[PDB]
Tab-separated table of C-alpha atoms in Angstrom:
chain	number	residue	atom	x	y	z
A	7	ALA	CA	64.514	49.047	-126.566
A	8	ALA	CA	65.570	51.672	-129.102
A	9	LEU	CA	65.304	55.339	-128.168
A	10	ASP	CA	61.853	56.718	-129.000
A	11	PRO	CA	61.967	60.517	-129.539
A	12	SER	CA	58.248	60.686	-128.678
A	13	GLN	CA	59.163	59.537	-125.157
A	14	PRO	CA	59.849	62.537	-122.885
A	15	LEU	CA	63.352	62.732	-121.423
A	16	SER	CA	64.400	63.848	-117.958
A	17	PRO	CA	66.313	67.109	-117.448
A	18	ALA	CA	70.032	66.613	-117.175
A	19	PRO	CA	71.782	67.845	-114.030
A	20	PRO	CA	74.051	70.863	-114.464
A	21	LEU	CA	77.695	70.049	-115.038
A	22	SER	CA	78.402	72.263	-112.017
A	23	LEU	CA	76.702	69.615	-109.869
A	24	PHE	CA	78.930	66.812	-111.161
A	25	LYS	CA	81.955	69.058	-110.632
A	26	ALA	CA	80.926	69.667	-107.011
A	27	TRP	CA	80.748	65.896	-106.542
A	28	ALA	CA	84.134	65.492	-108.253
A	29	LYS	CA	85.978	67.587	-105.652
A	30	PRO	CA	89.130	65.605	-104.777
A	31	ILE	CA	89.914	64.010	-101.431
A	32	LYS	CA	93.108	62.212	-100.501
A	33	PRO	CA	92.884	58.411	-100.866
A	34	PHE	CA	92.657	56.066	-97.897
A	35	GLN	CA	92.490	52.373	-97.022
A	36	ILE	CA	89.037	50.999	-96.217
A	37	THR	CA	90.457	47.599	-95.263
A	38	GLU	CA	93.337	45.377	-96.334
A	39	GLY	CA	93.326	45.249	-100.121
A	40	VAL	CA	90.601	47.918	-100.479
A	41	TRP	CA	91.467	51.547	-101.261
A	42	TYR	CA	89.184	54.505	-101.927
A	43	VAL	CA	90.597	56.505	-104.843
A	44	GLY	CA	87.459	58.448	-105.838
A	45	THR	CA	86.184	61.962	-105.203
A	46	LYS	CA	84.129	63.691	-102.509
A	47	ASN	CA	80.943	62.007	-103.740
A	48	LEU	CA	81.829	59.855	-106.805
A	49	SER	CA	83.111	56.492	-105.600
A	50	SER	CA	86.048	54.638	-107.122
A	51	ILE	CA	87.474	51.550	-105.415
A	52	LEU	CA	90.886	49.955	-105.985
A	53	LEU	CA	91.018	46.262	-105.068
A	54	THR	CA	94.674	45.253	-104.698
A	55	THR	CA	95.954	41.685	-105.085
A	56	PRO	CA	99.350	40.005	-105.587
A	57	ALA	CA	98.378	39.344	-109.231
A	58	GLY	CA	97.248	42.885	-110.084
A	59	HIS	CA	94.387	45.199	-109.296
A	60	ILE	CA	90.720	45.766	-110.074
A	61	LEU	CA	89.322	49.299	-110.281
A	62	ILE	CA	85.570	49.823	-109.888
A	63	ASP	CA	84.291	52.959	-111.672
A	64	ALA	CA	86.372	55.884	-112.937
A	65	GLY	CA	84.564	59.184	-112.290
A	66	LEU	CA	84.393	62.127	-114.655
A	67	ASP	CA	86.707	62.355	-117.643
A	68	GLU	CA	88.013	65.588	-116.112
A	69	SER	CA	88.896	63.468	-113.063
A	70	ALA	CA	90.957	60.812	-114.884
A	71	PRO	CA	94.334	62.493	-114.119
A	72	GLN	CA	93.283	62.889	-110.478
A	73	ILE	CA	92.162	59.241	-110.229
A	74	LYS	CA	95.562	58.070	-111.479
A	75	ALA	CA	97.351	60.411	-109.064
A	76	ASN	CA	95.199	59.021	-106.242
A	77	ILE	CA	96.104	55.415	-107.074
A	78	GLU	CA	99.770	56.430	-107.184
A	79	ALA	CA	99.570	58.471	-103.973
A	80	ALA	CA	98.383	55.261	-102.292
A	81	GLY	CA	101.573	53.571	-103.528
A	82	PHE	CA	100.044	51.609	-106.415
A	83	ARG	CA	100.290	51.951	-110.185
A	84	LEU	CA	97.723	52.239	-112.960
A	85	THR	CA	99.691	49.783	-115.117
A	86	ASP	CA	99.022	47.015	-112.561
A	87	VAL	CA	95.236	47.309	-112.946
A	88	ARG	CA	93.991	44.172	-114.705
A	89	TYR	CA	90.252	44.934	-114.817
A	90	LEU	CA	88.148	48.088	-114.988
A	91	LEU	CA	84.616	47.541	-113.694
A	92	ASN	CA	81.583	49.732	-114.381
A	93	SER	CA	78.459	50.066	-112.249
A	94	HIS	CA	76.417	52.145	-114.712
A	95	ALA	CA	77.362	53.934	-117.918
A	96	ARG	CA	77.020	57.638	-117.157
A	97	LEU	CA	79.691	60.319	-117.182
A	98	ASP	CA	80.181	60.367	-113.401
A	99	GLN	CA	81.080	56.655	-113.262
A	100	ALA	CA	82.472	55.935	-116.762
A	101	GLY	CA	83.648	59.343	-118.001
A	102	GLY	CA	87.310	58.492	-117.464
A	103	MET	CA	87.122	54.872	-118.633
A	104	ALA	CA	88.414	55.643	-122.132
A	105	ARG	CA	91.614	57.189	-120.790
A	106	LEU	CA	92.066	54.844	-117.822
A	107	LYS	CA	91.872	51.824	-120.139
A	108	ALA	CA	94.372	53.464	-122.495
A	109	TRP	CA	96.780	54.360	-119.675
A	110	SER	CA	96.568	50.895	-118.072
A	111	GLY	CA	95.856	48.438	-120.866
A	112	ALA	CA	93.356	46.745	-118.559
A	113	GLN	CA	90.213	44.954	-119.692
A	114	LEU	CA	86.967	46.868	-119.218
A	115	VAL	CA	84.235	44.662	-117.729
A	116	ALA	CA	80.558	45.610	-117.907
A	117	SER	CA	77.066	44.353	-118.631
A	118	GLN	CA	75.820	44.428	-122.206
A	119	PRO	CA	73.645	47.580	-121.796
A	120	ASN	CA	76.471	49.469	-120.085
A	121	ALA	CA	78.853	48.325	-122.829
A	122	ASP	CA	76.445	49.530	-125.523
A	123	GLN	CA	76.041	52.895	-123.773
A	124	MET	CA	79.765	53.327	-123.078
A	125	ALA	CA	80.469	52.528	-126.733
A	126	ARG	CA	78.042	55.315	-127.686
A	127	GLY	CA	79.913	57.718	-125.404
A	128	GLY	CA	76.883	57.973	-123.118
A	129	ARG	CA	74.370	58.881	-125.820
A	130	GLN	CA	70.881	57.391	-126.256
A	131	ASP	CA	70.499	57.308	-122.469
A	132	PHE	CA	66.926	56.199	-121.769
A	133	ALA	CA	66.317	59.198	-119.488
A	134	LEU	CA	68.970	61.759	-120.474
A	135	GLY	CA	69.317	61.276	-124.233
A	136	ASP	CA	72.581	62.769	-125.492
A	137	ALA	CA	72.684	65.411	-122.764
A	138	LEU	CA	75.823	64.190	-120.930
A	139	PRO	CA	78.325	62.618	-123.341
A	140	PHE	CA	81.755	61.285	-122.435
A	141	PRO	CA	84.689	59.652	-124.279
A	142	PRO	CA	83.553	56.408	-125.923
A	143	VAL	CA	85.230	53.167	-124.887
A	144	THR	CA	84.926	49.505	-125.863
A	145	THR	CA	84.128	46.806	-123.317
A	146	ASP	CA	86.414	43.759	-123.534
A	147	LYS	CA	84.560	41.336	-121.225
A	148	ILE	CA	80.772	41.239	-121.027
A	149	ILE	CA	79.818	40.174	-117.505
A	150	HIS	CA	76.617	38.295	-116.717
A	151	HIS	CA	74.441	38.025	-113.630
A	152	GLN	CA	76.184	36.053	-110.848
A	153	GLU	CA	79.310	35.656	-113.007
A	154	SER	CA	82.566	35.791	-111.052
A	155	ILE	CA	86.092	36.975	-111.824
A	156	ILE	CA	89.085	35.589	-109.911
A	157	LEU	CA	92.377	37.450	-109.536
A	158	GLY	CA	95.168	37.071	-107.000
A	159	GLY	CA	93.030	35.440	-104.326
A	160	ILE	CA	89.881	37.588	-104.324
A	161	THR	CA	86.509	36.915	-105.956
A	162	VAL	CA	84.439	39.636	-107.635
A	163	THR	CA	80.890	38.645	-108.576
A	164	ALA	CA	78.543	40.719	-110.718
A	165	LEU	CA	74.953	41.248	-109.574
A	166	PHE	CA	72.586	42.686	-112.161
A	167	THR	CA	70.610	45.381	-110.334
A	168	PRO	CA	68.771	47.202	-113.129
A	169	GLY	CA	66.527	50.201	-112.669
A	170	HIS	CA	68.749	53.263	-112.440
A	171	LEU	CA	69.981	52.147	-115.873
A	172	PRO	CA	69.031	48.978	-117.768
A	173	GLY	CA	72.557	47.621	-117.304
A	174	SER	CA	73.115	48.730	-113.704
A	175	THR	CA	75.532	46.320	-112.054
A	176	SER	CA	76.471	45.852	-108.413
A	177	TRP	CA	79.606	43.978	-107.375
A	178	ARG	CA	80.103	41.563	-104.475
A	179	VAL	CA	83.721	41.017	-103.425
A	180	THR	CA	85.287	38.347	-101.219
A	181	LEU	CA	88.669	39.633	-100.071
A	182	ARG	CA	91.943	37.958	-99.120
A	183	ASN	CA	91.226	38.558	-95.416
A	184	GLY	CA	87.903	36.688	-95.632
A	185	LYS	CA	85.794	39.828	-95.282
A	186	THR	CA	83.060	40.482	-97.835
A	187	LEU	CA	82.232	43.752	-99.567
A	188	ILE	CA	79.434	45.072	-101.765
A	189	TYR	CA	79.706	47.904	-104.282
A	190	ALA	CA	76.048	48.837	-104.717
A	191	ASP	CA	75.059	50.771	-107.811
A	192	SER	CA	72.443	53.504	-107.530
A	193	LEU	CA	68.846	52.401	-106.945
A	194	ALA	CA	67.471	55.849	-107.852
A	195	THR	CA	64.810	56.297	-110.531
A	196	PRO	CA	63.601	59.384	-112.447
A	197	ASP	CA	60.638	61.404	-111.250
A	198	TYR	CA	57.472	61.040	-113.362
A	199	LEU	CA	58.959	59.238	-116.377
A	200	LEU	CA	58.845	55.952	-114.457
A	201	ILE	CA	55.798	54.132	-115.788
A	202	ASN	CA	55.187	53.321	-119.449
A	203	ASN	CA	58.617	54.657	-120.417
A	204	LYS	CA	58.994	53.655	-124.066
A	205	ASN	CA	62.791	53.861	-123.787
A	206	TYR	CA	62.845	51.480	-120.785
A	207	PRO	CA	59.581	49.538	-120.487
A	208	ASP	CA	60.852	47.157	-117.775
A	209	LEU	CA	62.014	49.880	-115.356
A	210	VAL	CA	59.357	49.382	-112.676
A	211	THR	CA	59.819	45.610	-112.391
A	212	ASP	CA	63.610	45.802	-112.796
A	213	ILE	CA	64.082	48.144	-109.827
A	214	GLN	CA	61.816	45.979	-107.668
A	215	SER	CA	63.869	42.879	-108.429
A	216	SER	CA	67.020	44.881	-107.668
A	217	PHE	CA	65.652	45.728	-104.213
A	218	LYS	CA	65.260	42.002	-103.546
A	219	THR	CA	68.647	41.106	-105.044
A	220	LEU	CA	70.608	43.584	-102.922
A	221	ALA	CA	68.559	42.957	-99.769
A	222	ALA	CA	69.643	39.296	-99.955
A	223	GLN	CA	73.360	40.209	-99.816
A	224	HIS	CA	74.680	40.098	-96.238
A	225	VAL	CA	78.201	41.531	-96.342
A	226	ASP	CA	80.715	43.058	-93.941
A	227	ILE	CA	81.493	46.299	-95.810
A	228	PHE	CA	78.939	48.534	-97.549
A	229	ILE	CA	80.136	50.735	-100.423
A	230	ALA	CA	78.005	52.471	-103.053
A	231	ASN	CA	78.691	54.418	-106.238
A	232	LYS	CA	77.708	57.718	-104.571
A	233	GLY	CA	79.393	58.865	-101.377
A	234	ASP	CA	76.269	60.032	-99.556
A	235	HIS	CA	74.601	56.645	-100.168
A	236	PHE	CA	76.957	54.793	-97.786
A	237	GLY	CA	77.945	57.629	-95.431
A	238	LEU	CA	81.417	58.036	-96.938
A	239	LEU	CA	82.490	61.378	-95.482
A	240	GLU	CA	81.484	60.678	-91.877
A	241	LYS	CA	82.969	57.164	-91.996
A	242	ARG	CA	86.249	58.564	-93.344
A	243	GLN	CA	86.290	61.025	-90.437
A	244	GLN	CA	85.622	58.180	-87.997
A	245	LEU	CA	88.394	56.171	-89.661
A	246	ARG	CA	90.975	58.956	-89.321
A	247	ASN	CA	89.989	59.270	-85.640
A	248	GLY	CA	91.062	55.712	-84.770
A	249	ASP	CA	88.020	53.581	-85.712
A	250	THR	CA	89.266	51.015	-88.214
A	251	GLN	CA	85.845	49.299	-88.111
A	252	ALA	CA	84.250	52.497	-89.449
A	253	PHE	CA	83.428	51.109	-92.898
A	254	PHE	CA	82.284	47.774	-91.466
A	255	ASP	CA	78.491	48.037	-91.675
A	256	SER	CA	76.699	44.687	-91.864
A	257	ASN	CA	73.254	46.318	-92.098
A	258	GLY	CA	74.099	49.352	-94.231
A	259	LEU	CA	73.202	47.719	-97.538
A	260	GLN	CA	69.785	46.634	-96.265
A	261	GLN	CA	69.089	50.146	-94.964
A	262	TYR	CA	70.059	51.744	-98.287
A	263	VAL	CA	67.686	49.372	-100.104
A	264	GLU	CA	64.798	50.291	-97.800
A	265	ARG	CA	65.530	54.011	-98.177
A	266	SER	CA	65.623	53.547	-101.952
A	267	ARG	CA	62.380	51.552	-101.889
A	268	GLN	CA	60.550	54.192	-99.830
A	269	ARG	CA	61.639	57.000	-102.163
A	270	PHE	CA	60.584	54.913	-105.172
A	271	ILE	CA	57.099	54.516	-103.670
A	272	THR	CA	56.600	58.263	-103.161
A	273	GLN	CA	57.537	58.714	-106.832
A	274	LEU	CA	54.950	56.181	-108.017
A	275	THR	CA	52.311	57.992	-105.958
A	276	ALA	CA	53.099	61.309	-107.668
């Protein structure tokens, strides 16, 4: 749907909030071939393979130098990244895509709505409008639901989980060590402007099908695009205390879906 100015928009969060989430933390290894290179609350995952790397999400554009320094601090290089993956096309997940793609020469992979929004530099957002723009970037590979990419012995499969944005994409990964991982995009929806939203008429049914889609994924490792959605900070503290199984959470994804579903219900009631 095209943006209808007669449709009310949601208020945009203050930039100070995104900056607080973008506070840097030193990178660490979640498991073999999986490195966290993001910020205190904005996830970014580096999947390493013998044939090159895949980077999921990029954080704020202000954070692009820090993301690169994180990847390098972990001993890897931005020029070995083959694919850049996007969960949803807002400044806190795709702000640095324009400069990360330029610095790496990787292919950006995203769903068609995320590609359209990232090409607009974030504008025409169904809920935010042009409130939070970021450097525009072109997507090279449009990914489709249940479409897989193979690189260096891992498998990354896209799962369309719309609702937070029309193009919201989650990513299921099968690693070299046999373990499975999910990168769940946000399942959060805007207060009030949920029903009969002229900019996004399928929101209510989309998010409900996303609940089912993610609930069906039984994986070993639960990651999400926001740190406090998968207990990042307390798992990292457990990890640096000797628990290497800290990020192994076979039920975490199902719990996050139920928490998201409950919150969504209280919003429909209001």
